[PDB]
C-alpha cells in the first residue's frame, strides 16, 4: 500500500486496539477505488488463530445495508412500492393501528415506535403475528424516527414475498452472487466455520444467537475482502451489470427523511460531505442514535448524492463493525472487530483515516 495509507492506519488503528482492548481486527481502506487490507490479532484467542483476510466477522446492524439494497432491487423490479401498505403483503395484520403504515415507514424506522428489538420470546410465526398485532404505536406514522430491528426486519421479510423466495434465498441470488460476495453468509456453512472468528464479551467467546428477523436486521457474517467489495459496489453502482441491483444500490442511498444533519436511506444513513466530524462521532453514541427524533419527509426522495458521507454502525454481543464511504472521492473504510466497543471510537478513527486521505 502507499506509505501514506500504511502510516495513518498504523497511527490510528493500533492505538485504537490498545485503547479498546480489541483481540482481533480487520480493516480495509478503499483509496482511489482500490482496497488495501490490514489485520491485527486473533480470531480465536485460545487457539491462537490469527485474523486473516478470510476471517468471518459478525456484521451486526451493518446487515441492514444488505437488506436496504435488496429492498431497492425489489423496487427496481416493480415487485414492491415503498408507498404500499404493510397489509398488502401481510393481510393477517388486521389490527387498526396498521392502517396507514407503509413499507417506507418500516424501512426507515418511521412507523410510529416499533421497538428496538423483537422480543426474545417470539419463537414462531404465530408469536410474530401476535407481537405486531398487539403493538401500539406511540406516534402517528411518518413523524418520528426510532431505530428498530423490528421495523426494518419486517420490511426485509415482506419485500421478498412477491419473489416467492425466502429472505436468505433472495439475498443470495439477487445480491451476494451477482456481486461475487462468495464468503458472505446469513448462515455460515459447516465447511466455512473454520474461518468464523469468535466474539469476545467480558473475556468469553461468543457468537450471536438466533432470533426472529435476525438475517434482516443483524445476522450477516462476512470477510474483510467481501466487505471491501461491498463498499466498492456502493461507491460505483454503475459498475454493476445487473440493472435492478445497480438501481437498488442507488435507491438505498436516496434521502427519504432528514433529522438534524443526517438523512435516512434504506439501511444506509447519509450526511452531506464535507461532514462535521463531531456530528457523526457524537451521533453514533447509542444514547443518541437510538433515541426517538422528529423527521422531515423529503418528497420525492433525493436521488443518491455523490458528495455524501454514507455509513452504518453495527454490533453484536461480541463484535463491533463500521462502514463509511464517500462516493465523490472514491474513498471508504471497513472496520471489523471481535469485541463490541463504543461506536464513537469507531467513527472517530474512520474519520481520522479518511480525512487524512481526501
Ligand atoms: C445493530 O447492530 N443493532 C441494532 C442497534 N443498532 O445500533 S448500532 O449498532 O449503533 O447501529 C443496536 C443493537 C444492535 C443489535 O441488535 N445487534 O444484534 C444483537 C442481537 N440483537
Ligand atoms: Cl506511531
Ligand atoms: Zn506506533
Ligand atoms: Zn472459499
Short mmCIF file of C-alpha atoms and ligand atoms in Angstrom, two decimals:
data_model
loop_
_atom_site.label_atom_id
_atom_site.label_comp_id
_atom_site.label_asym_id
_atom_site.label_seq_id
_atom_site.Cartn_x
_atom_site.Cartn_y
_atom_site.Cartn_z
CA UNK A 1 0.00 0.00 0.00
CA UNK A 2 1.02 3.65 -0.37
CA UNK A 3 3.13 4.82 2.56
CA UNK A 4 0.56 7.48 3.45
CA UNK A 5 -2.09 4.79 3.97
CA UNK A 6 0.20 2.49 5.96
CA UNK A 7 1.23 5.39 8.20
CA UNK A 8 -2.24 6.73 9.02
CA UNK A 9 -3.64 3.22 9.55
CA UNK A 10 -0.88 2.28 11.98
CA UNK A 11 -1.12 5.56 13.92
CA UNK A 12 -4.93 5.36 14.12
CA UNK A 13 -5.86 1.69 14.42
CA UNK A 14 -3.01 0.26 16.50
CA UNK A 15 -3.72 2.79 19.30
CA UNK A 16 -7.46 2.19 18.96
CA UNK A 17 -6.78 -1.51 19.54
CA UNK A 18 -4.56 -0.63 22.53
CA UNK A 19 -7.19 1.74 23.96
CA UNK A 20 -10.18 -0.60 23.48
CA UNK A 21 -8.54 -3.99 24.21
CA UNK A 22 -9.67 -5.42 20.86
CA UNK A 23 -8.46 -9.03 20.39
CA UNK A 24 -8.68 -9.14 16.58
CA UNK A 25 -9.37 -6.61 13.86
CA UNK A 26 -9.52 -6.32 10.10
CA UNK A 27 -9.56 -3.02 8.19
CA UNK A 28 -9.94 -2.24 4.50
CA UNK A 29 -9.13 1.26 3.27
CA UNK A 30 -10.53 1.97 -0.18
CA UNK A 31 -8.40 4.69 -1.76
CA UNK A 32 -8.97 5.78 -5.36
CA UNK A 33 -11.35 2.85 -5.62
CA UNK A 34 -8.85 0.14 -4.58
CA UNK A 35 -8.85 -1.73 -1.26
CA UNK A 36 -5.83 -2.02 1.00
CA UNK A 37 -6.07 -4.59 3.76
CA UNK A 38 -4.76 -4.65 7.33
CA UNK A 39 -5.18 -7.23 10.08
CA UNK A 40 -4.27 -7.47 13.76
CA UNK A 41 -4.57 -10.04 16.49
CA UNK A 42 -6.59 -13.22 16.82
CA UNK A 43 -9.85 -14.58 15.50
CA UNK A 44 -9.69 -17.27 18.23
CA UNK A 45 -7.56 -16.31 21.24
CA UNK A 46 -7.25 -19.74 22.85
CA UNK A 47 -6.36 -21.44 19.55
CA UNK A 48 -4.01 -18.56 18.64
CA UNK A 49 -5.62 -18.39 15.20
CA UNK A 50 -4.74 -15.05 13.56
CA UNK A 51 -7.18 -12.73 11.89
CA UNK A 52 -6.70 -13.03 8.13
CA UNK A 53 -8.39 -11.57 5.06
CA UNK A 54 -10.57 -14.74 5.10
CA UNK A 55 -11.79 -14.37 8.70
CA UNK A 56 -15.56 -14.05 9.07
CA UNK A 57 -16.86 -11.38 11.45
CA UNK A 58 -20.41 -10.71 12.66
CA UNK A 59 -21.55 -7.52 10.92
CA UNK A 60 -24.43 -6.89 13.30
CA UNK A 61 -26.59 -3.97 12.17
CA UNK A 62 -24.37 -3.39 9.09
CA UNK A 63 -26.54 -6.26 7.78
CA UNK A 64 -29.28 -3.66 7.26
CA UNK A 65 -27.35 -2.20 4.31
CA UNK A 66 -27.77 -5.53 2.50
CA UNK A 67 -31.46 -5.54 3.45
CA UNK A 68 -31.92 -2.00 2.15
CA UNK A 69 -30.24 -2.78 -1.16
CA UNK A 70 -32.27 -5.97 -1.59
CA UNK A 71 -35.39 -3.90 -0.98
CA UNK A 72 -34.20 -1.36 -3.53
CA UNK A 73 -33.65 -4.18 -6.02
CA UNK A 74 -37.25 -5.30 -5.45
CA UNK A 75 -38.45 -1.73 -6.11
CA UNK A 76 -36.44 -1.68 -9.33
CA UNK A 77 -38.06 -4.99 -10.36
CA UNK A 78 -41.51 -3.48 -9.79
CA UNK A 79 -42.21 -6.13 -7.16
CA UNK A 80 -42.90 -3.60 -4.38
CA UNK A 81 -43.54 0.11 -3.96
CA UNK A 82 -42.47 1.97 -0.82
CA UNK A 83 -45.93 3.58 -0.67
CA UNK A 84 -47.59 0.16 -0.46
CA UNK A 85 -49.42 -0.61 2.80
CA UNK A 86 -47.87 -3.25 5.03
CA UNK A 87 -51.16 -5.13 4.89
CA UNK A 88 -50.80 -5.67 1.14
CA UNK A 89 -48.05 -8.19 1.99
CA UNK A 90 -49.40 -9.40 5.36
CA UNK A 91 -53.21 -9.22 5.24
CA UNK A 92 -53.45 -11.08 8.57
CA UNK A 93 -52.18 -7.85 10.20
CA UNK A 94 -55.76 -6.71 10.71
CA UNK A 95 -55.24 -4.52 13.79
CA UNK A 96 -56.37 -0.97 13.05
CA UNK A 97 -53.09 0.69 14.07
CA UNK A 98 -51.56 -0.72 10.87
CA UNK A 99 -53.81 1.37 8.62
CA UNK A 100 -51.50 3.92 7.05
CA UNK A 101 -48.19 2.19 7.83
CA UNK A 102 -46.32 1.65 4.56
CA UNK A 103 -43.22 -0.25 3.52
CA UNK A 104 -41.42 3.10 3.56
CA UNK A 105 -42.25 3.54 7.24
CA UNK A 106 -40.96 0.06 8.07
CA UNK A 107 -37.75 0.50 6.08
CA UNK A 108 -36.89 3.88 7.65
CA UNK A 109 -37.91 3.35 11.32
CA UNK A 110 -40.83 5.80 10.98
CA UNK A 111 -43.87 3.57 11.58
CA UNK A 112 -44.51 5.19 14.98
CA UNK A 113 -42.39 3.47 17.60
CA UNK A 114 -41.87 -0.15 16.68
CA UNK A 115 -39.38 -1.40 19.30
CA UNK A 116 -35.61 -1.66 19.04
CA UNK A 117 -35.70 -5.46 19.38
CA UNK A 118 -38.18 -8.16 18.53
CA UNK A 119 -38.82 -9.77 21.95
CA UNK A 120 -36.70 -12.84 22.62
CA UNK A 121 -39.85 -14.87 23.38
CA UNK A 122 -41.02 -14.59 19.75
CA UNK A 123 -40.11 -18.08 18.51
CA UNK A 124 -42.82 -18.96 15.95
CA UNK A 125 -44.70 -17.33 13.10
CA UNK A 126 -47.72 -17.30 15.43
CA UNK A 127 -45.71 -15.41 18.05
CA UNK A 128 -44.57 -12.89 15.44
CA UNK A 129 -48.10 -12.08 14.26
CA UNK A 130 -49.23 -11.65 17.86
CA UNK A 131 -46.32 -9.30 18.52
CA UNK A 132 -47.17 -6.97 15.64
CA UNK A 133 -50.94 -7.29 16.13
CA UNK A 134 -50.63 -6.16 19.77
CA UNK A 135 -48.02 -3.43 19.30
CA UNK A 136 -49.45 0.02 20.00
CA UNK A 137 -47.73 2.99 18.31
CA UNK A 138 -46.54 5.96 20.32
CA UNK A 139 -46.73 8.32 17.32
CA UNK A 140 -48.53 8.71 14.03
CA UNK A 141 -46.65 7.17 11.09
CA UNK A 142 -44.10 9.29 9.29
CA UNK A 143 -43.41 11.71 12.16
CA UNK A 144 -40.69 10.22 14.40
CA UNK A 145 -37.66 8.05 13.67
CA UNK A 146 -36.94 5.38 16.30
CA UNK A 147 -34.22 2.97 15.14
CA UNK A 148 -35.70 -0.52 15.31
CA UNK A 149 -34.74 -4.03 14.24
CA UNK A 150 -38.45 -4.92 14.41
CA UNK A 151 -39.13 -2.25 11.77
CA UNK A 152 -36.56 -2.84 9.04
CA UNK A 153 -36.64 -6.54 9.88
CA UNK A 154 -40.29 -6.70 8.89
CA UNK A 155 -39.56 -4.62 5.79
CA UNK A 156 -36.99 -7.17 4.60
CA UNK A 157 -39.27 -10.15 5.24
CA UNK A 158 -42.16 -8.56 3.34
CA UNK A 159 -40.10 -7.07 0.49
CA UNK A 160 -39.15 -10.58 -0.72
CA UNK A 161 -42.67 -12.02 -0.67
CA UNK A 162 -43.50 -11.16 -4.32
CA UNK A 163 -40.41 -13.08 -5.42
CA UNK A 164 -41.63 -16.29 -3.81
CA UNK A 165 -38.13 -16.72 -2.35
CA UNK A 166 -37.09 -16.82 1.26
CA UNK A 167 -35.20 -13.79 2.51
CA UNK A 168 -31.98 -15.83 2.52
CA UNK A 169 -32.52 -17.21 -0.99
CA UNK A 170 -33.39 -13.75 -2.34
CA UNK A 171 -30.29 -12.21 -0.75
CA UNK A 172 -28.02 -14.99 -2.04
CA UNK A 173 -29.40 -14.97 -5.59
CA UNK A 174 -30.02 -11.24 -6.03
CA UNK A 175 -27.19 -9.57 -4.06
CA UNK A 176 -24.41 -11.86 -2.84
CA UNK A 177 -23.93 -13.93 -6.01
CA UNK A 178 -24.02 -11.10 -8.61
CA UNK A 179 -21.52 -9.10 -6.55
CA UNK A 180 -19.29 -12.17 -6.04
CA UNK A 181 -19.58 -11.96 -2.24
CA UNK A 182 -18.79 -15.65 -2.02
CA UNK A 183 -17.71 -15.54 1.65
CA UNK A 184 -20.70 -13.61 2.99
CA UNK A 185 -23.30 -15.66 4.82
CA UNK A 186 -26.57 -15.41 6.66
CA UNK A 187 -25.90 -18.97 7.88
CA UNK A 188 -22.23 -19.99 7.94
CA UNK A 189 -21.93 -23.42 6.27
CA UNK A 190 -20.05 -26.16 8.15
CA UNK A 191 -17.11 -26.08 5.74
CA UNK A 192 -16.62 -22.35 6.45
CA UNK A 193 -16.85 -22.48 10.27
CA UNK A 194 -13.05 -22.75 10.43
CA UNK A 195 -12.94 -19.10 9.32
CA UNK A 196 -15.59 -17.82 11.76
CA UNK A 197 -13.99 -15.61 14.39
CA UNK A 198 -15.15 -15.73 17.98
CA UNK A 199 -16.52 -12.58 19.50
CA UNK A 200 -15.30 -11.62 22.97
CA UNK A 201 -17.55 -10.23 25.69
CA UNK A 202 -16.25 -9.98 29.26
CA UNK A 203 -13.43 -12.29 28.19
CA UNK A 204 -15.76 -15.06 26.96
CA UNK A 205 -16.01 -16.35 23.39
CA UNK A 206 -19.48 -15.77 21.95
CA UNK A 207 -21.47 -15.86 18.73
CA UNK A 208 -24.76 -14.11 18.03
CA UNK A 209 -27.84 -16.08 19.00
CA UNK A 210 -30.71 -16.90 16.63
CA UNK A 211 -33.67 -14.56 16.77
CA UNK A 212 -36.74 -13.56 14.82
CA UNK A 213 -35.87 -11.45 11.75
CA UNK A 214 -32.17 -11.75 12.59
CA UNK A 215 -30.98 -12.15 8.98
CA UNK A 216 -32.73 -8.91 8.02
CA UNK A 217 -31.51 -6.79 10.94
CA UNK A 218 -28.21 -8.07 12.35
CA UNK A 219 -27.33 -11.59 11.21
CA UNK A 220 -24.86 -11.43 8.29
CA UNK A 221 -21.22 -12.58 8.62
CA UNK A 222 -18.55 -11.55 6.12
CA UNK A 223 -14.82 -11.19 5.50
CA UNK A 224 -12.83 -8.00 5.12
CA UNK A 225 -12.39 -8.76 1.40
CA UNK A 226 -16.10 -9.21 0.71
CA UNK A 227 -16.90 -6.09 2.76
CA UNK A 228 -14.39 -4.07 0.73
CA UNK A 229 -16.14 -5.33 -2.42
CA UNK A 230 -19.50 -4.34 -0.89
CA UNK A 231 -18.12 -0.83 -0.34
CA UNK A 232 -16.78 -0.71 -3.92
CA UNK A 233 -20.22 -1.73 -5.20
CA UNK A 234 -21.91 1.05 -3.21
CA UNK A 235 -19.25 3.57 -4.32
CA UNK A 236 -19.59 2.68 -8.02
CA UNK A 237 -23.09 1.33 -8.72
CA UNK A 238 -22.71 1.87 -12.46
CA UNK A 239 -20.08 -0.88 -12.49
CA UNK A 240 -22.81 -3.39 -11.53
CA UNK A 241 -24.07 -5.06 -14.69
CA UNK A 242 -27.43 -6.19 -13.24
CA UNK A 243 -29.61 -3.12 -13.76
CA UNK A 244 -32.04 -3.84 -10.91
CA UNK A 245 -29.15 -4.19 -8.45
CA UNK A 246 -27.39 -1.09 -9.74
CA UNK A 247 -30.67 0.74 -9.20
CA UNK A 248 -31.29 -0.89 -5.81
CA UNK A 249 -27.90 0.34 -4.60
CA UNK A 250 -28.79 3.84 -5.76
CA UNK A 251 -32.24 3.73 -4.14
CA UNK A 252 -30.75 2.66 -0.80
CA UNK A 253 -28.71 5.89 -0.84
CA UNK A 254 -31.69 8.08 -1.67
CA UNK A 255 -32.61 10.52 1.11
CA UNK A 256 -36.10 9.78 2.46
CA UNK A 257 -36.10 11.70 5.76
CA UNK A 258 -33.94 14.33 7.44
CA UNK A 259 -33.27 14.92 11.13
CA UNK A 260 -30.60 17.43 12.02
CA UNK A 261 -27.76 16.91 9.56
CA UNK A 262 -28.48 13.22 8.91
CA UNK A 263 -30.56 11.64 6.17
CA UNK A 264 -32.15 8.20 6.32
CA UNK A 265 -31.69 5.84 3.38
CA UNK A 266 -32.62 2.16 3.10
CA UNK A 267 -30.23 0.73 5.66
CA UNK A 268 -27.56 3.29 4.87
CA UNK A 269 -27.52 6.68 6.58
CA UNK A 270 -26.01 9.72 4.89
CA UNK A 271 -24.75 13.23 5.58
CA UNK A 272 -23.56 15.93 3.20
CA UNK A 273 -19.79 15.91 2.53
CA UNK A 274 -17.76 17.65 3.88
CA UNK A 275 -19.20 16.48 7.19
CA UNK A 276 -18.81 17.92 10.67
CA UNK A 277 -16.84 15.07 12.27
CA UNK A 278 -18.24 15.77 15.72
CA UNK A 279 -21.77 15.25 14.40
CA UNK A 280 -21.07 11.76 13.06
CA UNK A 281 -18.95 10.83 16.09
CA UNK A 282 -21.38 12.11 18.71
CA UNK A 283 -24.41 10.99 16.72
CA UNK A 284 -23.19 7.39 16.75
CA UNK A 285 -23.46 7.10 20.54
CA UNK A 286 -26.28 4.69 21.43
CA UNK A 287 -27.91 7.33 23.65
CA UNK A 288 -28.41 9.49 20.53
CA UNK A 289 -28.62 7.01 17.67
CA UNK A 290 -31.37 5.05 19.39
CA UNK A 291 -33.44 7.97 20.67
CA UNK A 292 -36.71 8.99 19.08
CA UNK A 293 -36.28 12.10 16.94
CA UNK A 294 -38.70 14.02 14.70
CA UNK A 295 -38.15 13.64 10.96
CA UNK A 296 -38.99 15.81 7.97
CA UNK A 297 -40.06 14.00 4.81
CA UNK A 298 -38.16 14.51 1.57
CA UNK A 299 -40.69 14.11 -1.26
CA UNK A 300 -39.57 12.99 -3.73
CA UNK A 301 -36.60 11.35 -2.03
CA UNK A 302 -33.34 13.00 -3.05
CA UNK A 303 -31.54 10.73 -5.56
CA UNK A 304 -28.22 9.47 -4.19
CA UNK A 305 -25.89 12.43 -3.68
CA UNK A 306 -22.28 11.69 -4.63
CA UNK A 307 -20.93 14.29 -2.17
CA UNK A 308 -22.09 12.36 0.88
CA UNK A 309 -20.62 10.56 3.86
CA UNK A 310 -22.52 7.25 3.71
CA UNK A 311 -22.19 4.94 6.68
CA UNK A 312 -23.52 2.32 9.08
CA UNK A 313 -22.51 1.02 12.52
CA UNK A 314 -23.14 -2.49 13.76
CA UNK A 315 -22.65 -4.63 16.83
CA UNK A 316 -23.41 -7.98 18.40
CA UNK A 317 -22.56 -9.16 21.90
CA UNK A 318 -19.02 -9.93 20.80
CA UNK A 319 -18.38 -7.83 17.68
CA UNK A 320 -18.22 -4.20 16.55
CA UNK A 321 -18.31 -3.07 12.93
CA UNK A 322 -18.32 0.16 10.96
CA UNK A 323 -18.50 1.01 7.26
CA UNK A 324 -18.20 4.50 5.76
CA UNK A 325 -17.60 5.82 2.25
CA UNK A 326 -17.65 9.00 0.16
CA UNK A 327 -18.75 8.33 -3.46
CA UNK A 328 -17.40 11.61 -4.87
CA UNK A 329 -13.92 10.81 -3.52
CA UNK A 330 -13.91 7.04 -4.24
CA UNK A 331 -12.83 6.69 -0.62
CA UNK A 332 -14.06 4.28 2.04
CA UNK A 333 -13.27 2.16 5.06
CA UNK A 334 -14.44 -1.08 6.66
CA UNK A 335 -13.54 -1.79 10.30
CA UNK A 336 -14.38 -5.26 11.69
CA UNK A 337 -13.50 -6.22 15.26
CA UNK A 338 -14.31 -9.16 17.53
CA UNK A 339 -15.14 -7.01 20.53
CA UNK A 340 -18.14 -4.67 20.84
CA UNK A 341 -16.51 -1.32 21.67
CA UNK A 342 -18.20 2.09 21.61
CA UNK A 343 -19.40 3.49 18.29
CA UNK A 344 -17.83 6.97 18.76
CA UNK A 345 -14.36 5.42 18.95
CA UNK A 346 -15.02 3.62 15.64
CA UNK A 347 -16.30 6.69 13.84
CA UNK A 348 -13.52 8.93 15.14
CA UNK A 349 -10.88 6.51 13.86
CA UNK A 350 -12.60 6.19 10.48
CA UNK A 351 -12.79 9.95 10.03
CA UNK A 352 -9.14 10.44 11.01
CA UNK A 353 -8.15 7.98 8.29
CA UNK A 354 -10.45 9.22 5.52
CA UNK A 355 -9.79 12.90 6.32
CA UNK A 356 -6.04 12.23 6.03
CA UNK A 357 -6.51 10.66 2.58
CA UNK A 358 -9.00 13.04 0.94
C1 LIG B 1 -27.15 -3.49 15.24
O1 LIG B 1 -26.03 -3.85 15.32
N1 LIG B 1 -28.01 -3.42 16.39
C2 LIG B 1 -29.30 -2.66 16.45
C3 LIG B 1 -28.94 -1.37 17.23
N2 LIG B 1 -28.07 -0.69 16.21
O2 LIG B 1 -27.36 0.35 16.81
S1 LIG B 1 -25.90 0.41 16.03
O3 LIG B 1 -25.07 -0.85 16.05
O4 LIG B 1 -25.14 1.53 16.71
O5 LIG B 1 -26.10 0.92 14.63
C4 LIG B 1 -28.28 -1.66 18.49
C5 LIG B 1 -28.21 -3.09 18.86
C6 LIG B 1 -27.63 -3.96 17.73
C7 LIG B 1 -28.18 -5.35 17.67
O6 LIG B 1 -29.35 -5.56 17.79
N3 LIG B 1 -27.23 -6.45 17.39
O7 LIG B 1 -27.69 -7.77 17.29
C8 LIG B 1 -27.50 -8.45 18.51
C9 LIG B 1 -28.78 -9.26 18.80
N4 LIG B 1 -29.95 -8.37 18.94
CL1 LIG B 2 3.46 5.53 15.86
ZN1 LIG B 3 3.15 3.44 16.60
ZN1 LIG B 4 -13.70 -20.30 -0.03
#
